[PDB]
């Protein structure tokens, strides 16, 4: 009385037509349990009749949600409709083997001529299927089942536990790592090219140590010679001639003592200067972007302290959760000076707590804390 069974997988349903039945009175027996484990006979016990894949990960997700919740999905309805032989329900109704006693009623109300069985007998059939699996399908289904398992598992998890999007923080973490190391290696390359081009012209080096402006000045000056009063006014359109620096560099170039060098060195070093200039632009841009994300995700802690410093705390702690979680002395770990510092540590622990666990932050409440600490400092 178990003619058909329904089995399902992450990527697609299947229906099997059982060709026999393992006997029923004695199905805790040593022998029949072994026969379920030993594929050499369970093949005789079941053969595949159909397999209906899924269309996309999204539809597989919504389908798995439904088969959890106990309602029949559209693909499920269609596959059963295409499979099951019909009957006049009053005499000799058909039988299907399912594991969800909860699902049973929905199937019955849809098809008034099908009986869902879930005994220990049918759970054993499905266990045999769950065990052997991919050998049974004869190959109809391509795909890294296991990969689909992990993916769908994550998706179903997130969907129900209600993960949020803005509350991401690793972006803040990696952002601050970038800004720090980026300032470091930008300065490295800045003094690199500074020494290198001072080989040709060290007067500019001793004049301006400012790096990005150094890069732009290198971008203008090709060699220490092709500089006129027109170039003087051009540097005036650039940084400053009122400071006299344009006159300084033109005089030092007229008297220039750095040995002039190969043309190809001028072009490639100009390429280098363009590189460092674009990189500095990039760092400033990313800094502003960090400001944006901080004021969006956690403006509370930031307004209490500052964008970059709040990112320092979040990174060094590990994440926004952990930083909010831990008590208000580790936040100090990460005379009047000590006193005001500890007070601020407690209040920033506060700000972090609210600013994480909420669904969105409150700059005004952050400002209230800021003003309270400010009035205490004034009390000092």
């Amino acid at each position: 009385p178990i003619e058909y069974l329904l089995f399902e997988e992450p990527t697609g349903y299947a229906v099997f037509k059982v060709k026999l039945q393992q006997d029923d009175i004695g199905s805790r027996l040593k022998e029949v349990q072994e026969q379920i484990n030993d594929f050499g006979a369970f093949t005789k016990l079941i053969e595949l009749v159909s397999f209906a894949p899924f269309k996309g990960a999204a539809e597989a997700l919504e389908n798995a949600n439904d088969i959890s919740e106990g309602l029949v999905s559209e693909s499920l309805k269609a596959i059963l409709d295409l499979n099951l032989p019909k009957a006049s329900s009053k005499k000799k109704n058909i039988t299907l083997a399912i594991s969800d006693k909860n699902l049973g009623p929905s199937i019955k109300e849809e098809f008034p001529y099908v009986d869902c069985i879930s005994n220990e007998l049918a759970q054993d059939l499905i266990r045999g299927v769950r065990l052997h699996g991919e050998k049974l399908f004869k190959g109809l289904q391509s795909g890294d089942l296991e990969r689909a398992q992990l993916g769908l598992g994550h998706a179903y998890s997130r969907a129900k536990v209600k993960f949020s999007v803005q509350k991401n923080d690793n972006h803040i973490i990696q952002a601050i790592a970038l800004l720090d190391q980026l300032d470091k290696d930008i300065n490295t390359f800045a003094m690199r090219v500074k020494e290198w081009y001072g080989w040709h012209f060290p007067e500019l080096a001793k004049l301006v140590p400012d790096n990005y402006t150094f890069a732009k000045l290198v971008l203008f000056i090709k060699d220490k010679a092709s500089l006129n009063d027109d170039s003087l006014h051009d540097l005036a359109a650039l940084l400053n001639e009122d400071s006299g620096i344009a006159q300084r560099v033109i005089d030092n170039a007229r008297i220039s003592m750095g040995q002039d060098i190969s043309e190809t060195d001028m072009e490639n070093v100009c390429v280098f200067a363009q590189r460092v200039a674009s990189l500095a632009d990039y760092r400033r841009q990313l800094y502003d972007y960090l400001c944006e994300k901080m004021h969006t995700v956690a403006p509370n802690l930031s307004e209490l302290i500052g964008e970059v410093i709040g990112a320092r705390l979040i990174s060094h702690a590990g994440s926004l959760t952990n930083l909010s979680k831990q008590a208000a002395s580790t936040v100090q770990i990460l005379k009047n000076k000590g006193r005001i510092s500890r007070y601020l540590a407690n209040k920033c622990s506060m700000a972090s707590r609210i600013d994480n666990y909420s669904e969105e932050p409150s700059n005004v409440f952050g400002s209230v804390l800021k003003k309270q600490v400010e009035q205490r400092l004034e009390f000092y």
């Binding site: 909010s324 979680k325 831990q326 008590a327 208000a328 002395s329 506060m350 707590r353 609210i354 994480n356 666990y357 909420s358 409150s362 409440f365």
Partner: protein, 123 residues
């Protein structure tokens, strides 16, 4: 439609048992009173259970904590008044979080275990 971020919160009778047990506890020094006190007991693994209030402004200061409680398997409750909790825990300002600590050498032992089980049933 969603349960509020304070659930659970007790009815008045259970409020009475909680606050009374808290008071005797504070008089017998089995009690770490204060939000950071509570978080640090939870960390140190010496907590019998956790009371806290659900009217402080804002609520999220202490809403952080039951995360630790659920992970570590210790029960937690929200009483409807930091003012009442303060007057019952015996200090000068409103209190929003307190933790009853473990020690079996406790002359209120059976009292606290019965009340803790009441809480577990609330959940």
């Amino acid at each position: 439609a969603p349960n509020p971020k304070a659930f659970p919160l007790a009815d008045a009778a259970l409020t009475q048992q909680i606050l009374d047990v808290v008071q005797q506890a504070a008089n017998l020094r089995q009690l770490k009173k204060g939000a950071n006190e509570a978080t640090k007991t939870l960390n140190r693994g010496i907590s019998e259970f956790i009371i806290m209030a659900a009217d402080c402004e804002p609520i999220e200061i202490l809403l952080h904590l039951p995360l630790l409680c659920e992970d570590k398997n210790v029960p937690y409750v929200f009483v409807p008044s930091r003012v009442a909790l303060g007057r019952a825990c015996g200090v000068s300002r409103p209190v929003i979080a307190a933790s009853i600590t473990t020690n079996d050498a406790s002359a209120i032992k059976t009292q606290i275990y019965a009340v803790k089980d009441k809480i577990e049933t609330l959940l």
